[PDB]
Amino acid sequence: ESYYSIGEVSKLANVSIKALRYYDKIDLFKPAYVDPDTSYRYYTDSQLIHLDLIKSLKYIGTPLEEMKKAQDLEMEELFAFYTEQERQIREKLDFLSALEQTISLVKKRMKRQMEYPALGEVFVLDEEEIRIIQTEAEGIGPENVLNASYSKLKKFIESADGFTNNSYGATFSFQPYTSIDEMTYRHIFTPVLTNKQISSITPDMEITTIPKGRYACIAYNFSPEHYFLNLQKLIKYIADRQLTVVSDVYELIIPIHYSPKKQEEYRVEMKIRIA
Amino acid sequence: ESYYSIGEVSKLANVSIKALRYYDKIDLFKPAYVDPDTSYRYYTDSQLIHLDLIKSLKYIGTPLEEMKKAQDLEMEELFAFYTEQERQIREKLDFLSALEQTISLVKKRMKRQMEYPALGEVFVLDEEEIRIIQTEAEGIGPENVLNASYSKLKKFIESADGFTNNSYGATFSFQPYTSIDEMTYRHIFTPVLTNKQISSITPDMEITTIPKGRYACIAYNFSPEHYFLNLQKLIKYIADRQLTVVSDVYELIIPIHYSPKKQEEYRVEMKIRIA
DNA sequence: GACCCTCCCCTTAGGGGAGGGTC
DNA sequence: GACCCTCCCCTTAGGGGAGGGTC
Ligand SMILES: c1ccc([P+](c2ccccc2)(c2ccccc2)c2ccccc2)cc1
Ligand SMILES: c1ccc([P+](c2ccccc2)(c2ccccc2)c2ccccc2)cc1
């Protein structure tokens, strides 16, 4: 025999008035009585129990329309409904976990590039391996490589990492080049930021790595003159100390910013493994 | 010197055409050139790099508008941006973890009620404790208790569990009542499905529990006649075997369904601890 | 004076067409 | 014949008012 106005229900069940009017229009939760003259909504006490399901399902993210079918299932079916919710949550969990790990890897590589000792100077450090996915360069060289060239690689990596690669790589035979027009890339590649199985990789792609070891490295902001100059520094560094190269030259490029406004600028790093 | 149509960009960066037009209108990613006669959009190769940030941020859920400010920050600021993303992810994680645990508890109590041996029959089982939050009943009894009476309790429990309580409880002194109008509740309560700290609980509420021990129990679907009949069975069961009661009578009620259409029906369970 | 009601506008990220040009 | 363009409608869950009755 006790009835409540929309405001009272709102204060009692901690649900906004607008939400009550909406659930009314949606036919999810309608007032027991509507005054035909004022259109005022009135609710009964026993009815409040229905807001328990609605609030709990809202808390777990169930869409309103699906709530309508939830209040129609039996306690047994509701049990299963929750089982399904757990499955989805475990699915959300590992997605966030993987993402949490990926982000951490990105920051690690990001910091490493911000902590670089100096630009335009050859350094010899002990590197850890870098997992990559590569494909033959098809005759492409430093002057004609395009972002579009990495299209097939990015698709695969995006399908397993989600976080699209930010670094673009290429490799070439270590030679005493006297001109850029003399060099041709062997492979182009993109590092993989995840260990998630890849969805049926075609044979024209190879999963491999930049092996851990001692590397002669040099980093700098790209410019045609810098590219040539720094490559020659690397070559001279190796000849001067008669070092022995045991891998191709690895070239990684990463933009310094992604602003469509500012003049584009890229960071380049060349590495060559030595005995 | 190489340019692409919207379709080509779509196939290259795996982004829908509609999305490209939208990012164009939003001024997040605009084509390098727009044909003044056909309005056809054309993109340059160097521009594709900007879709890397956009896609990665979309993958982590960053809203488009905030992406515009992300492509304006420095590599240092971007590093921090990710730090903030990790913080939010860890926040999402424990929320899902807690929810995963709560759901499991709900299913456990839900199953227990579906596996009940029989209705209207007294059983003596060894119960595990049930954490609850209670408040004095203020003279309320079986005939005048309302859903609204639990308003203050539900607010607090909802503030810590999120999953609003589904079970409503009450307690009363074990007496040889000959009529319902003779009984008055001592406390009304609602179990807590979480161990999450409660936000400043007022003193008119008490956090306590239904202690683990041996309980004389009985469950049934509510009806005025059943309520009285089953209470008398409990009283007789205890007197017949001269059992000693060491707690008040606990009364838990949970709806059998939350359909606003079907006739309401509730499941009731009475429990009294014995030495 | 508080409370309640009914429109009306608005948010986010595009998808699914319809009608008509354009590679 | 495929590709591309410009509207137009639509989704989800209400929030924030404006104008005017109603406790
Ligand atoms: C005493 C108790 C309840 C109502 P009524 C109501 C009146 C006429 C027709 C149907 C219902 C009500 C109506 C408008 C404002 C206040 C009270 C009423 C009864 C049960 C549930 C809701 C409303 C009136 C007097
Ligand atoms: C040869 C190479 C590029 C173009 P255009 C272009 C034409 C006129 C004015 C500005 C741009 C082009 C336009 C419409 C359809 C196809 C090609 C062109 C150039 C750079 C980037 C995008 C488009 C035309 C001939």
Side-chain angles (χ1 to χ4, degrees), chain A residues 12 45 52 55 83 86 107 147 151 154 158 168, chain B residues 12 45 52 55 83 86 107 147 154 158 168:
Chain A
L12 291 172
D45 189 79
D52 282 349
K55 285 156 73 179
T83 298
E86 291 175 300
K107 281 176 60 179
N147 291 310
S151 196
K154 293 176 67 61
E158 278 166 30
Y168 293 67
Chain B
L12 291 172
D45 189 79
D52 282 349
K55 285 156 73 179
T83 298
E86 291 175 300
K107 281 176 60 179
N147 291 310
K154 293 176 67 61
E158 278 166 30
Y168 293 67

mmCIF file with all atom_site columns, all heavy atoms in Angstrom, chain A residues 12 45 52 55 83 86 107 147 151 154 158 168, chain B residues 12 45 52 55 83 86 107 147 154 158 168:
data_model
loop_
_atom_site.group_PDB
_atom_site.id
_atom_site.type_symbol
_atom_site.label_atom_id
_atom_site.label_alt_id
_atom_site.label_comp_id
_atom_site.label_asym_id
_atom_site.label_entity_id
_atom_site.label_seq_id
_atom_site.pdbx_PDB_ins_code
_atom_site.Cartn_x
_atom_site.Cartn_y
_atom_site.Cartn_z
_atom_site.occupancy
_atom_site.B_iso_or_equiv
_atom_site.pdbx_formal_charge
_atom_site.auth_seq_id
_atom_site.auth_comp_id
_atom_site.auth_asym_id
_atom_site.auth_atom_id
_atom_site.pdbx_PDB_model_num
ATOM 1   N N   . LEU A 1 12  ? 16.113 6.211   -3.426  1.00 0.00 ? 12  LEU A N   1
ATOM 2   C CA  . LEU A 1 12  ? 16.175 4.882   -2.806  1.00 0.00 ? 12  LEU A CA  1
ATOM 3   C C   . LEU A 1 12  ? 17.110 3.874   -3.468  1.00 0.00 ? 12  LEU A C   1
ATOM 4   O O   . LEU A 1 12  ? 17.858 3.169   -2.786  1.00 0.00 ? 12  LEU A O   1
ATOM 5   C CB  . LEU A 1 12  ? 14.782 4.243   -2.737  1.00 0.00 ? 12  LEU A CB  1
ATOM 6   C CG  . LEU A 1 12  ? 13.756 4.845   -1.778  1.00 0.00 ? 12  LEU A CG  1
ATOM 7   C CD1 . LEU A 1 12  ? 12.399 4.188   -2.031  1.00 0.00 ? 12  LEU A CD1 1
ATOM 8   C CD2 . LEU A 1 12  ? 14.209 4.638   -0.325  1.00 0.00 ? 12  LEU A CD2 1
ATOM 9   N N   . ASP A 1 45  ? 6.570  -0.587  -3.809  1.00 0.00 ? 45  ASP A N   1
ATOM 10  C CA  . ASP A 1 45  ? 7.728  -1.124  -3.121  1.00 0.00 ? 45  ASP A CA  1
ATOM 11  C C   . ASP A 1 45  ? 8.210  -2.458  -3.703  1.00 0.00 ? 45  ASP A C   1
ATOM 12  O O   . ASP A 1 45  ? 9.393  -2.610  -3.978  1.00 0.00 ? 45  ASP A O   1
ATOM 13  C CB  . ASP A 1 45  ? 7.445  -1.301  -1.630  1.00 0.00 ? 45  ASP A CB  1
ATOM 14  C CG  . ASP A 1 45  ? 8.704  -1.656  -0.839  1.00 0.00 ? 45  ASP A CG  1
ATOM 15  O OD1 . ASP A 1 45  ? 9.504  -0.742  -0.537  1.00 0.00 ? 45  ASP A OD1 1
ATOM 16  O OD2 . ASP A 1 45  ? 8.901  -2.855  -0.530  1.00 0.00 ? 45  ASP A OD2 1
ATOM 17  N N   . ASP A 1 52  ? 17.459 -4.439  -8.918  1.00 0.00 ? 52  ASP A N   1
ATOM 18  C CA  . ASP A 1 52  ? 18.643 -5.182  -8.484  1.00 0.00 ? 52  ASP A CA  1
ATOM 19  C C   . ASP A 1 52  ? 19.340 -5.821  -9.688  1.00 0.00 ? 52  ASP A C   1
ATOM 20  O O   . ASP A 1 52  ? 20.552 -5.698  -9.850  1.00 0.00 ? 52  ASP A O   1
ATOM 21  C CB  . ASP A 1 52  ? 18.277 -6.286  -7.482  1.00 0.00 ? 52  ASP A CB  1
ATOM 22  C CG  . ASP A 1 52  ? 18.039 -5.757  -6.077  1.00 0.00 ? 52  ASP A CG  1
ATOM 23  O OD1 . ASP A 1 52  ? 18.358 -4.576  -5.809  1.00 0.00 ? 52  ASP A OD1 1
ATOM 24  O OD2 . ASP A 1 52  ? 17.540 -6.536  -5.235  1.00 0.00 ? 52  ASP A OD2 1
ATOM 25  N N   . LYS A 1 55  ? 20.672 -3.022  -12.129 1.00 0.00 ? 55  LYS A N   1
ATOM 26  C CA  . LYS A 1 55  ? 21.894 -2.371  -11.648 1.00 0.00 ? 55  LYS A CA  1
ATOM 27  C C   . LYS A 1 55  ? 23.108 -3.287  -11.718 1.00 0.00 ? 55  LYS A C   1
ATOM 28  O O   . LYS A 1 55  ? 24.189 -2.863  -12.106 1.00 0.00 ? 55  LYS A O   1
ATOM 29  C CB  . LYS A 1 55  ? 21.710 -1.864  -10.223 1.00 0.00 ? 55  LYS A CB  1
ATOM 30  C CG  . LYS A 1 55  ? 20.864 -0.602  -10.158 1.00 0.00 ? 55  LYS A CG  1
ATOM 31  C CD  . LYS A 1 55  ? 20.190 -0.411  -8.799  1.00 0.00 ? 55  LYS A CD  1
ATOM 32  C CE  . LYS A 1 55  ? 21.148 0.014   -7.702  1.00 0.00 ? 55  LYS A CE  1
ATOM 33  N NZ  . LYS A 1 55  ? 20.385 0.186   -6.422  1.00 0.00 ? 55  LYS A NZ  1
ATOM 34  N N   . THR A 1 83  ? 28.161 -17.593 -16.301 1.00 0.00 ? 83  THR A N   1
ATOM 35  C CA  . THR A 1 83  ? 29.286 -18.394 -16.745 1.00 0.00 ? 83  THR A CA  1
ATOM 36  C C   . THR A 1 83  ? 29.860 -17.741 -18.000 1.00 0.00 ? 83  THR A C   1
ATOM 37  O O   . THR A 1 83  ? 31.078 -17.654 -18.172 1.00 0.00 ? 83  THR A O   1
ATOM 38  C CB  . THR A 1 83  ? 28.839 -19.820 -17.081 1.00 0.00 ? 83  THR A CB  1
ATOM 39  O OG1 . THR A 1 83  ? 28.307 -20.435 -15.901 1.00 0.00 ? 83  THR A OG1 1
ATOM 40  C CG2 . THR A 1 83  ? 30.015 -20.640 -17.597 1.00 0.00 ? 83  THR A CG2 1
ATOM 41  N N   . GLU A 1 86  ? 31.797 -14.628 -17.196 1.00 0.00 ? 86  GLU A N   1
ATOM 42  C CA  . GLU A 1 86  ? 33.130 -14.913 -16.690 1.00 0.00 ? 86  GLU A CA  1
ATOM 43  C C   . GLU A 1 86  ? 34.076 -15.164 -17.854 1.00 0.00 ? 86  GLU A C   1
ATOM 44  O O   . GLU A 1 86  ? 35.219 -14.700 -17.855 1.00 0.00 ? 86  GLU A O   1
ATOM 45  C CB  . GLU A 1 86  ? 33.102 -16.136 -15.772 1.00 0.00 ? 86  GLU A CB  1
ATOM 46  C CG  . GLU A 1 86  ? 32.386 -15.894 -14.459 1.00 0.00 ? 86  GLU A CG  1
ATOM 47  C CD  . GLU A 1 86  ? 32.260 -17.156 -13.621 1.00 0.00 ? 86  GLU A CD  1
ATOM 48  O OE1 . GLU A 1 86  ? 31.633 -18.122 -14.103 1.00 0.00 ? 86  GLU A OE1 1
ATOM 49  O OE2 . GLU A 1 86  ? 32.787 -17.179 -12.485 1.00 0.00 ? 86  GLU A OE2 1
ATOM 50  N N   . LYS A 1 107 ? 57.723 1.337   -24.481 1.00 0.00 ? 107 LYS A N   1
ATOM 51  C CA  . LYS A 1 107 ? 58.388 2.336   -23.647 1.00 0.00 ? 107 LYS A CA  1
ATOM 52  C C   . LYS A 1 107 ? 59.869 2.000   -23.500 1.00 0.00 ? 107 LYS A C   1
ATOM 53  O O   . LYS A 1 107 ? 60.714 2.900   -23.492 1.00 0.00 ? 107 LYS A O   1
ATOM 54  C CB  . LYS A 1 107 ? 57.740 2.403   -22.252 1.00 0.00 ? 107 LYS A CB  1
ATOM 55  C CG  . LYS A 1 107 ? 56.435 3.190   -22.189 1.00 0.00 ? 107 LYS A CG  1
ATOM 56  C CD  . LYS A 1 107 ? 55.787 3.137   -20.800 1.00 0.00 ? 107 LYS A CD  1
ATOM 57  C CE  . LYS A 1 107 ? 56.688 3.720   -19.714 1.00 0.00 ? 107 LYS A CE  1
ATOM 58  N NZ  . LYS A 1 107 ? 56.044 3.697   -18.364 1.00 0.00 ? 107 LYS A NZ  1
ATOM 59  N N   . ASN A 1 147 ? 56.641 3.521   -47.506 1.00 0.00 ? 147 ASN A N   1
ATOM 60  C CA  . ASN A 1 147 ? 55.906 3.016   -46.353 1.00 0.00 ? 147 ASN A CA  1
ATOM 61  C C   . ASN A 1 147 ? 55.039 1.879   -46.874 1.00 0.00 ? 147 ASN A C   1
ATOM 62  O O   . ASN A 1 147 ? 54.893 0.853   -46.214 1.00 0.00 ? 147 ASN A O   1
ATOM 63  C CB  . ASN A 1 147 ? 55.017 4.095   -45.742 1.00 0.00 ? 147 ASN A CB  1
ATOM 64  C CG  . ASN A 1 147 ? 55.819 5.201   -45.072 1.00 0.00 ? 147 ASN A CG  1
ATOM 65  O OD1 . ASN A 1 147 ? 56.707 4.940   -44.263 1.00 0.00 ? 147 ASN A OD1 1
ATOM 66  N ND2 . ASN A 1 147 ? 55.504 6.444   -45.406 1.00 0.00 ? 147 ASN A ND2 1
ATOM 67  N N   . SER A 1 151 ? 53.495 -2.797  -46.265 1.00 0.00 ? 151 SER A N   1
ATOM 68  C CA  . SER A 1 151 ? 52.089 -3.143  -46.144 1.00 0.00 ? 151 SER A CA  1
ATOM 69  C C   . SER A 1 151 ? 51.780 -4.571  -45.689 1.00 0.00 ? 151 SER A C   1
ATOM 70  O O   . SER A 1 151 ? 51.042 -4.762  -44.717 1.00 0.00 ? 151 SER A O   1
ATOM 71  C CB  . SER A 1 151 ? 51.376 -2.886  -47.472 1.00 0.00 ? 151 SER A CB  1
ATOM 72  O OG  . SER A 1 151 ? 49.977 -2.869  -47.266 1.00 0.00 ? 151 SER A OG  1
ATOM 73  N N   . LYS A 1 154 ? 53.172 -5.227  -42.058 1.00 0.00 ? 154 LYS A N   1
ATOM 74  C CA  . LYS A 1 154 ? 52.379 -4.603  -41.008 1.00 0.00 ? 154 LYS A CA  1
ATOM 75  C C   . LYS A 1 154 ? 51.060 -5.329  -40.745 1.00 0.00 ? 154 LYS A C   1
ATOM 76  O O   . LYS A 1 154 ? 50.649 -5.458  -39.597 1.00 0.00 ? 154 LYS A O   1
ATOM 77  C CB  . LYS A 1 154 ? 52.129 -3.123  -41.324 1.00 0.00 ? 154 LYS A CB  1
ATOM 78  C CG  . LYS A 1 154 ? 53.396 -2.266  -41.280 1.00 0.00 ? 154 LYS A CG  1
ATOM 79  C CD  . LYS A 1 154 ? 53.122 -0.810  -41.693 1.00 0.00 ? 154 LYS A CD  1
ATOM 80  C CE  . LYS A 1 154 ? 52.243 -0.074  -40.684 1.00 0.00 ? 154 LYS A CE  1
ATOM 81  N NZ  . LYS A 1 154 ? 52.863 0.005   -39.332 1.00 0.00 ? 154 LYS A NZ  1
ATOM 82  N N   . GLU A 1 158 ? 50.257 -6.557  -37.114 1.00 0.00 ? 158 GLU A N   1
ATOM 83  C CA  . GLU A 1 158 ? 49.109 -5.919  -36.482 1.00 0.00 ? 158 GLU A CA  1
ATOM 84  C C   . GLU A 1 158 ? 48.108 -6.964  -36.034 1.00 0.00 ? 158 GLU A C   1
ATOM 85  O O   . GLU A 1 158 ? 47.414 -6.787  -35.033 1.00 0.00 ? 158 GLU A O   1
ATOM 86  C CB  . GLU A 1 158 ? 48.442 -4.946  -37.447 1.00 0.00 ? 158 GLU A CB  1
ATOM 87  C CG  . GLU A 1 158 ? 49.126 -3.589  -37.490 1.00 0.00 ? 158 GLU A CG  1
ATOM 88  C CD  . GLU A 1 158 ? 48.691 -2.747  -38.680 1.00 0.00 ? 158 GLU A CD  1
ATOM 89  O OE1 . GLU A 1 158 ? 47.529 -2.900  -39.132 1.00 0.00 ? 158 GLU A OE1 1
ATOM 90  O OE2 . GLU A 1 158 ? 49.514 -1.927  -39.152 1.00 0.00 ? 158 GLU A OE2 1
ATOM 91  N N   . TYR A 1 168 ? 60.656 0.888   -38.632 1.00 0.00 ? 168 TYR A N   1
ATOM 92  C CA  . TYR A 1 168 ? 60.751 0.241   -39.930 1.00 0.00 ? 168 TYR A CA  1
ATOM 93  C C   . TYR A 1 168 ? 62.191 -0.170  -40.140 1.00 0.00 ? 168 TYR A C   1
ATOM 94  O O   . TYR A 1 168 ? 63.105 0.622   -39.911 1.00 0.00 ? 168 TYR A O   1
ATOM 95  C CB  . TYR A 1 168 ? 60.327 1.189   -41.044 1.00 0.00 ? 168 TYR A CB  1
ATOM 96  C CG  . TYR A 1 168 ? 58.866 1.540   -41.011 1.00 0.00 ? 168 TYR A CG  1
ATOM 97  C CD1 . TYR A 1 168 ? 58.331 2.291   -39.964 1.00 0.00 ? 168 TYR A CD1 1
ATOM 98  C CD2 . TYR A 1 168 ? 58.010 1.106   -42.018 1.00 0.00 ? 168 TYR A CD2 1
ATOM 99  C CE1 . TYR A 1 168 ? 56.975 2.599   -39.922 1.00 0.00 ? 168 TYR A CE1 1
ATOM 100 C CE2 . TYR A 1 168 ? 56.655 1.409   -41.989 1.00 0.00 ? 168 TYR A CE2 1
ATOM 101 C CZ  . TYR A 1 168 ? 56.143 2.152   -40.936 1.00 0.00 ? 168 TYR A CZ  1
ATOM 102 O OH  . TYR A 1 168 ? 54.796 2.422   -40.892 1.00 0.00 ? 168 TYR A OH  1
ATOM 103 N N   . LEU B 1 12  ? 46.018 -0.645  -48.090 1.00 0.00 ? 12  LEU B N   1
ATOM 104 C CA  . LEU B 1 12  ? 47.383 -0.631  -47.552 1.00 0.00 ? 12  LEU B CA  1
ATOM 105 C C   . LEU B 1 12  ? 47.507 -0.599  -46.032 1.00 0.00 ? 12  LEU B C   1
ATOM 106 O O   . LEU B 1 12  ? 48.315 -1.328  -45.451 1.00 0.00 ? 12  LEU B O   1
ATOM 107 C CB  . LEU B 1 12  ? 48.180 0.558   -48.104 1.00 0.00 ? 12  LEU B CB  1
ATOM 108 C CG  . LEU B 1 12  ? 48.565 0.546   -49.584 1.00 0.00 ? 12  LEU B CG  1
ATOM 109 C CD1 . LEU B 1 12  ? 49.159 1.907   -49.949 1.00 0.00 ? 12  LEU B CD1 1
ATOM 110 C CD2 . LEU B 1 12  ? 49.566 -0.586  -49.858 1.00 0.00 ? 12  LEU B CD2 1
ATOM 111 N N   . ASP B 1 45  ? 52.699 8.792   -50.028 1.00 0.00 ? 45  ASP B N   1
ATOM 112 C CA  . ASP B 1 45  ? 53.304 7.703   -49.286 1.00 0.00 ? 45  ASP B CA  1
ATOM 113 C C   . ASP B 1 45  ? 53.811 8.126   -47.901 1.00 0.00 ? 45  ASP B C   1
ATOM 114 O O   . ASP B 1 45  ? 53.506 7.468   -46.915 1.00 0.00 ? 45  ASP B O   1
ATOM 115 C CB  . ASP B 1 45  ? 54.456 7.079   -50.071 1.00 0.00 ? 45  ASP B CB  1
ATOM 116 C CG  . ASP B 1 45  ? 54.974 5.796   -49.421 1.00 0.00 ? 45  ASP B CG  1
ATOM 117 O OD1 . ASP B 1 45  ? 54.336 4.733   -49.592 1.00 0.00 ? 45  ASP B OD1 1
ATOM 118 O OD2 . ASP B 1 45  ? 56.016 5.853   -48.726 1.00 0.00 ? 45  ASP B OD2 1
ATOM 119 N N   . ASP B 1 52  ? 50.023 5.074   -38.258 1.00 0.00 ? 52  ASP B N   1
ATOM 120 C CA  . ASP B 1 52  ? 50.610 4.184   -37.256 1.00 0.00 ? 52  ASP B CA  1
ATOM 121 C C   . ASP B 1 52  ? 50.159 4.595   -35.851 1.00 0.00 ? 52  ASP B C   1
ATOM 122 O O   . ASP B 1 52  ? 49.719 3.761   -35.063 1.00 0.00 ? 52  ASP B O   1
ATOM 123 C CB  . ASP B 1 52  ? 52.144 4.211   -37.310 1.00 0.00 ? 52  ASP B CB  1
ATOM 124 C CG  . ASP B 1 52  ? 52.712 3.378   -38.447 1.00 0.00 ? 52  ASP B CG  1
ATOM 125 O OD1 . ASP B 1 52  ? 51.953 2.603   -39.073 1.00 0.00 ? 52  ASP B OD1 1
ATOM 126 O OD2 . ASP B 1 52  ? 53.931 3.493   -38.705 1.00 0.00 ? 52  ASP B OD2 1
ATOM 127 N N   . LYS B 1 55  ? 46.253 4.169   -35.498 1.00 0.00 ? 55  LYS B N   1
ATOM 128 C CA  . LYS B 1 55  ? 45.839 2.774   -35.324 1.00 0.00 ? 55  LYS B CA  1
ATOM 129 C C   . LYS B 1 55  ? 46.221 2.218   -33.960 1.00 0.00 ? 55  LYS B C   1
ATOM 130 O O   . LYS B 1 55  ? 45.440 1.519   -33.329 1.00 0.00 ? 55  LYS B O   1
ATOM 131 C CB  . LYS B 1 55  ? 46.425 1.896   -36.423 1.00 0.00 ? 55  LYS B CB  1
ATOM 132 C CG  . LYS B 1 55  ? 45.710 2.073   -37.753 1.00 0.00 ? 55  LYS B CG  1
ATOM 133 C CD  . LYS B 1 55  ? 46.585 1.697   -38.949 1.00 0.00 ? 55  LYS B CD  1
ATOM 134 C CE  . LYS B 1 55  ? 46.788 0.201   -39.105 1.00 0.00 ? 55  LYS B CE  1
ATOM 135 N NZ  . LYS B 1 55  ? 47.645 -0.057  -40.310 1.00 0.00 ? 55  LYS B NZ  1
ATOM 136 N N   . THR B 1 83  ? 52.752 5.848   -19.981 1.00 0.00 ? 83  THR B N   1
ATOM 137 C CA  . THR B 1 83  ? 52.826 5.543   -18.565 1.00 0.00 ? 83  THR B CA  1
ATOM 138 C C   . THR B 1 83  ? 51.418 5.659   -17.987 1.00 0.00 ? 83  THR B C   1
ATOM 139 O O   . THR B 1 83  ? 50.996 4.839   -17.169 1.00 0.00 ? 83  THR B O   1
ATOM 140 C CB  . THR B 1 83  ? 53.747 6.532   -17.845 1.00 0.00 ? 83  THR B CB  1
ATOM 141 O OG1 . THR B 1 83  ? 55.071 6.417   -18.382 1.00 0.00 ? 83  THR B OG1 1
ATOM 142 C CG2 . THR B 1 83  ? 53.779 6.240   -16.349 1.00 0.00 ? 83  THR B CG2 1
ATOM 143 N N   . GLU B 1 86  ? 49.257 2.752   -18.972 1.00 0.00 ? 86  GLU B N   1
ATOM 144 C CA  . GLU B 1 86  ? 49.525 1.563   -18.180 1.00 0.00 ? 86  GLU B CA  1
ATOM 145 C C   . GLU B 1 86  ? 48.765 1.642   -16.866 1.00 0.00 ? 86  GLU B C   1
ATOM 146 O O   . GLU B 1 86  ? 48.191 0.653   -16.402 1.00 0.00 ? 86  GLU B O   1
ATOM 147 C CB  . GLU B 1 86  ? 51.023 1.430   -17.906 1.00 0.00 ? 86  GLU B CB  1
ATOM 148 C CG  . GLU B 1 86  ? 51.840 1.096   -19.137 1.00 0.00 ? 86  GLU B CG  1
ATOM 149 C CD  . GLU B 1 86  ? 53.335 1.095   -18.865 1.00 0.00 ? 86  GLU B CD  1
ATOM 150 O OE1 . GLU B 1 86  ? 53.861 2.155   -18.465 1.00 0.00 ? 86  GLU B OE1 1
ATOM 151 O OE2 . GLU B 1 86  ? 53.980 0.038   -19.050 1.00 0.00 ? 86  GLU B OE2 1
ATOM 152 N N   . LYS B 1 107 ? 27.561 -17.112 -8.257  1.00 0.00 ? 107 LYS B N   1
ATOM 153 C CA  . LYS B 1 107 ? 27.231 -18.419 -8.819  1.00 0.00 ? 107 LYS B CA  1
ATOM 154 C C   . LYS B 1 107 ? 27.273 -19.487 -7.730  1.00 0.00 ? 107 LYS B C   1
ATOM 155 O O   . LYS B 1 107 ? 26.446 -20.404 -7.724  1.00 0.00 ? 107 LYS B O   1
ATOM 156 C CB  . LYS B 1 107 ? 28.215 -18.796 -9.941  1.00 0.00 ? 107 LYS B CB  1
ATOM 157 C CG  . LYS B 1 107 ? 27.942 -18.128 -11.284 1.00 0.00 ? 107 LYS B CG  1
ATOM 158 C CD  . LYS B 1 107 ? 29.011 -18.463 -12.332 1.00 0.00 ? 107 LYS B CD  1
ATOM 159 C CE  . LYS B 1 107 ? 29.102 -19.961 -12.613 1.00 0.00 ? 107 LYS B CE  1
ATOM 160 N NZ  . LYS B 1 107 ? 30.122 -20.284 -13.658 1.00 0.00 ? 107 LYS B NZ  1
ATOM 161 N N   . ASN B 1 147 ? 11.279 -3.290  0.685   1.00 0.00 ? 147 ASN B N   1
ATOM 162 C CA  . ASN B 1 147 ? 12.545 -3.274  -0.037  1.00 0.00 ? 147 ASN B CA  1
ATOM 163 C C   . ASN B 1 147 ? 13.219 -1.960  0.328   1.00 0.00 ? 147 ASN B C   1
ATOM 164 O O   . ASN B 1 147 ? 14.430 -1.916  0.531   1.00 0.00 ? 147 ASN B O   1
ATOM 165 C CB  . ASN B 1 147 ? 12.326 -3.333  -1.546  1.00 0.00 ? 147 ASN B CB  1
ATOM 166 C CG  . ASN B 1 147 ? 11.784 -4.679  -2.005  1.00 0.00 ? 147 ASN B CG  1
ATOM 167 O OD1 . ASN B 1 147 ? 12.320 -5.730  -1.659  1.00 0.00 ? 147 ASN B OD1 1
ATOM 168 N ND2 . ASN B 1 147 ? 10.718 -4.648  -2.791  1.00 0.00 ? 147 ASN B ND2 1
ATOM 169 N N   . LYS B 1 154 ? 21.936 -1.169  1.068   1.00 0.00 ? 154 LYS B N   1
ATOM 170 C CA  . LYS B 1 154 ? 22.318 -1.413  -0.316  1.00 0.00 ? 154 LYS B CA  1
ATOM 171 C C   . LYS B 1 154 ? 23.288 -0.366  -0.861  1.00 0.00 ? 154 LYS B C   1
ATOM 172 O O   . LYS B 1 154 ? 24.210 -0.707  -1.596  1.00 0.00 ? 154 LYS B O   1
ATOM 173 C CB  . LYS B 1 154 ? 21.075 -1.517  -1.210  1.00 0.00 ? 154 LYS B CB  1
ATOM 174 C CG  . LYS B 1 154 ? 20.218 -2.751  -0.923  1.00 0.00 ? 154 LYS B CG  1
ATOM 175 C CD  . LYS B 1 154 ? 18.936 -2.773  -1.772  1.00 0.00 ? 154 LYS B CD  1
ATOM 176 C CE  . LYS B 1 154 ? 19.225 -2.965  -3.259  1.00 0.00 ? 154 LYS B CE  1
ATOM 177 N NZ  . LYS B 1 154 ? 19.916 -4.253  -3.548  1.00 0.00 ? 154 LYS B NZ  1
ATOM 178 N N   . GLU B 1 158 ? 26.703 -1.545  -2.375  1.00 0.00 ? 158 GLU B N   1
ATOM 179 C CA  . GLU B 1 158 ? 26.875 -1.283  -3.798  1.00 0.00 ? 158 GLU B CA  1
ATOM 180 C C   . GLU B 1 158 ? 28.136 -0.477  -4.036  1.00 0.00 ? 158 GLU B C   1
ATOM 181 O O   . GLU B 1 158 ? 28.793 -0.621  -5.065  1.00 0.00 ? 158 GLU B O   1
ATOM 182 C CB  . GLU B 1 158 ? 25.670 -0.531  -4.351  1.00 0.00 ? 158 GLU B CB  1
ATOM 183 C CG  . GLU B 1 158 ? 24.506 -1.446  -4.697  1.00 0.00 ? 158 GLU B CG  1
ATOM 184 C CD  . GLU B 1 158 ? 23.205 -0.687  -4.916  1.00 0.00 ? 158 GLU B CD  1
ATOM 185 O OE1 . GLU B 1 158 ? 23.260 0.486   -5.361  1.00 0.00 ? 158 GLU B OE1 1
ATOM 186 O OE2 . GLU B 1 158 ? 22.130 -1.276  -4.648  1.00 0.00 ? 158 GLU B OE2 1
ATOM 187 N N   . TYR B 1 168 ? 18.143 -10.685 0.635   1.00 0.00 ? 168 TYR B N   1
ATOM 188 C CA  . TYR B 1 168 ? 17.759 -9.772  1.699   1.00 0.00 ? 168 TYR B CA  1
ATOM 189 C C   . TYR B 1 168 ? 17.634 -10.573 2.975   1.00 0.00 ? 168 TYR B C   1
ATOM 190 O O   . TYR B 1 168 ? 17.016 -11.637 2.986   1.00 0.00 ? 168 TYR B O   1
ATOM 191 C CB  . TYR B 1 168 ? 16.428 -9.102  1.389   1.00 0.00 ? 168 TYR B CB  1
ATOM 192 C CG  . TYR B 1 168 ? 16.487 -8.160  0.218   1.00 0.00 ? 168 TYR B CG  1
ATOM 193 C CD1 . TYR B 1 168 ? 16.720 -8.633  -1.073  1.00 0.00 ? 168 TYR B CD1 1
ATOM 194 C CD2 . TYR B 1 168 ? 16.327 -6.791  0.402   1.00 0.00 ? 168 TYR B CD2 1
ATOM 195 C CE1 . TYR B 1 168 ? 16.795 -7.761  -2.154  1.00 0.00 ? 168 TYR B CE1 1
ATOM 196 C CE2 . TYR B 1 168 ? 16.398 -5.909  -0.668  1.00 0.00 ? 168 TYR B CE2 1
ATOM 197 C CZ  . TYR B 1 168 ? 16.636 -6.400  -1.943  1.00 0.00 ? 168 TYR B CZ  1
ATOM 198 O OH  . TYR B 1 168 ? 16.738 -5.523  -2.996  1.00 0.00 ? 168 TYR B OH  1
#
